[PDB]
Every structure is written in structure tokens, then in C-alpha cells.
Scaffold this active site. Structure first.
Site, PDB file in Angstrom:
ATOM      1  N   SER A 119     119.648  31.622  63.172  1.00  0.00           N
ATOM      2  CA  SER A 119     118.748  30.575  62.722  1.00  0.00           C
ATOM      3  C   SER A 119     119.274  30.059  61.382  1.00  0.00           C
ATOM      4  O   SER A 119     120.180  30.647  60.788  1.00  0.00           O
ATOM      5  CB  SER A 119     117.331  31.112  62.583  1.00  0.00           C
ATOM      6  OG  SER A 119     117.291  32.165  61.631  1.00  0.00           O
TER       7      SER A 119
ATOM      8  N   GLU B 189     114.730  29.393  45.979  1.00  0.00           N
ATOM      9  CA  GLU B 189     115.100  29.216  47.373  1.00  0.00           C
ATOM     10  C   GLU B 189     116.211  28.200  47.538  1.00  0.00           C
ATOM     11  O   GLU B 189     117.163  28.442  48.262  1.00  0.00           O
ATOM     12  CB  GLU B 189     113.901  28.771  48.207  1.00  0.00           C
ATOM     13  CG  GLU B 189     112.924  29.884  48.555  1.00  0.00           C
ATOM     14  CD  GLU B 189     113.509  30.949  49.479  1.00  0.00           C
ATOM     15  OE1 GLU B 189     114.623  30.764  50.006  1.00  0.00           O
ATOM     16  OE2 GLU B 189     112.844  31.977  49.691  1.00  0.00           O
TER      17      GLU B 189
ATOM     18  N   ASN C  23     112.641  28.181  57.919  1.00  0.00           N
ATOM     19  CA  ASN C  23     113.476  28.701  58.990  1.00  0.00           C
ATOM     20  C   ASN C  23     113.298  28.066  60.368  1.00  0.00           C
ATOM     21  O   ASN C  23     112.170  27.840  60.828  1.00  0.00           O
ATOM     22  CB  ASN C  23     113.294  30.219  59.050  1.00  0.00           C
ATOM     23  CG  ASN C  23     114.332  30.904  59.913  1.00  0.00           C
ATOM     24  OD1 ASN C  23     113.995  31.502  60.916  1.00  0.00           O
ATOM     25  ND2 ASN C  23     115.596  30.781  59.554  1.00  0.00           N
TER      26      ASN C  23
ATOM     27  N   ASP D 278     120.801  36.108  62.471  1.00  0.00           N
ATOM     28  CA  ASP D 278     120.204  35.962  63.796  1.00  0.00           C
ATOM     29  C   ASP D 278     120.581  34.622  64.458  1.00  0.00           C
ATOM     30  O   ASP D 278     120.276  34.387  65.625  1.00  0.00           O
ATOM     31  CB  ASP D 278     118.681  36.145  63.733  1.00  0.00           C
ATOM     32  CG  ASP D 278     117.991  35.121  62.857  1.00  0.00           C
ATOM     33  OD1 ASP D 278     118.659  34.246  62.289  1.00  0.00           O
ATOM     34  OD2 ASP D 278     116.756  35.163  62.739  1.00  0.00           O
TER      35      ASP D 278
ATOM     36  N   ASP E  15     118.008  28.090  57.502  1.00  0.00           N
ATOM     37  CA  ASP E  15     116.929  27.724  56.588  1.00  0.00           C
ATOM     38  C   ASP E  15     117.234  26.322  56.044  1.00  0.00           C
ATOM     39  O   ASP E  15     118.370  26.030  55.650  1.00  0.00           O
ATOM     40  CB  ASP E  15     116.840  28.721  55.449  1.00  0.00           C
ATOM     41  CG  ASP E  15     116.572  30.113  55.926  1.00  0.00           C
ATOM     42  OD1 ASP E  15     115.912  30.290  56.960  1.00  0.00           O
ATOM     43  OD2 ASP E  15     117.026  31.050  55.260  1.00  0.00           O
TER      44      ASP E  15
ATOM     45  N   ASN F  47     121.442  32.174  58.907  1.00  0.00           N
ATOM     46  CA  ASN F  47     121.099  33.577  58.883  1.00  0.00           C
ATOM     47  C   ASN F  47     121.864  34.284  59.981  1.00  0.00           C
ATOM     48  O   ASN F  47     122.390  33.642  60.886  1.00  0.00           O
ATOM     49  CB  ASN F  47     119.597  33.720  59.072  1.00  0.00           C
ATOM     50  CG  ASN F  47     118.816  32.924  58.044  1.00  0.00           C
ATOM     51  OD1 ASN F  47     117.917  32.155  58.375  1.00  0.00           O
ATOM     52  ND2 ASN F  47     119.175  33.092  56.787  1.00  0.00           N
TER      53      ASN F  47
END
Length: 129
Positions: A50, A35, A59, A48, A52, A46
Site C-alpha cells: 500500500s 507525516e 493509506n 504490504d 501513504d 509500505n
């Protein structure tokens, strides 16, 4: 901070992740590796809108507040920046709520696609814990 493999395993163990919700420590070390590559400061936006954050790429759409994700829920009640700290405590406490959310570790795409069903034991092999 960029953690070493065994160094991270030990910090996660002390934090109570070994076998939390039935997931052995190797699962958690494998997920962090894929990750964030063991980097507490990793961030990724991301599509959308958002983002991470941290070692476990938590998120902003659901778990933390970054002030720029319209409609986010902040379920861990923390500013996303708290997740980038060298001290992994905040990331671990939030991860505990996420893994208890019903879908287990499948919540983490890299775990699902790269750790799930593999010999995750190898991730802690050789470490003094």
C-alpha cells in the site's frame, strides 16, 4: 504545495479540524509536520504494497483508491491522487472519518510517537488564526 506552519493551521481551522473529536489544532499541525513535512505531494510506499498519500499520509489499504493495492477498501471513496492536491479539503474530510474510526489520532504513527503527550500548543504559537 509545501505549506507554512501558520498557513496550514489556518486552513485546517477553517476546515473544521480545531477540536474535532476533541483534538486541538496543534495536534493536527504536529501530525502533518511529522507525516509529510507540510508537503501535500508526499507519498511513501509500505511493505504490504500500500502507499501513504498527502499532507496526512492517508493509506491506500483502507481509505483511498490508487488502483494498485489489492484488497483496499476505499472508505473515503476517493482516488488517492485527490489527496495530493494543494487544496487540503479532501485530506481533511478523509482524516475526519479516520479519526472517528475508534482509535483516534493513534491511527497516525508519527502523531503517536512524536506528538502525543507533548506541548502541541507550540505548533500554533504565534499564528493569527
Amino acid at each position: 504545495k509545501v505549506f507554512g506552519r501558520c498557513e496550514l493551521a489556518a486552513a485546517m481551522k477553517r476546515a473544521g479540524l480545531d477540536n474535532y473529536r476533541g483534538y486541538s489544532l496543534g495536534n493536527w499541525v504536529c501530525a502533518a509536520k511529522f507525516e509529510s513535512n507540510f508537503n501535500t505531494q508526499a507519498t511513501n510506499r509500505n511493505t504490504d504494497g500500500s502507499t501513504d498519500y498527502g499532507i496526512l499520509q492517508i493509506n491506500s489499504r483502507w481509505w483511498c483508491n490508487d488502483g494498485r493495492t489489492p484488497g483496499s477498501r476505499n472508505l473515503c471513496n476517493i482516488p488517492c491522487s485527490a489527496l495530493l492536491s494543494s487544496d487540503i479539503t479532501a485530506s481533511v474530510n478523509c482524516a475526519k472519518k479516520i479519526v472517528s474510526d475508534g482509535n483516534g489520532m493513534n491511527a497516525w504513527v508519527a502523531w503517536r510517537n512524536r506528538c502525543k503527550g507533548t506541548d502541541v500548543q507550540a505548533w500554533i504559537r504565534g499564528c493569527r488564526l
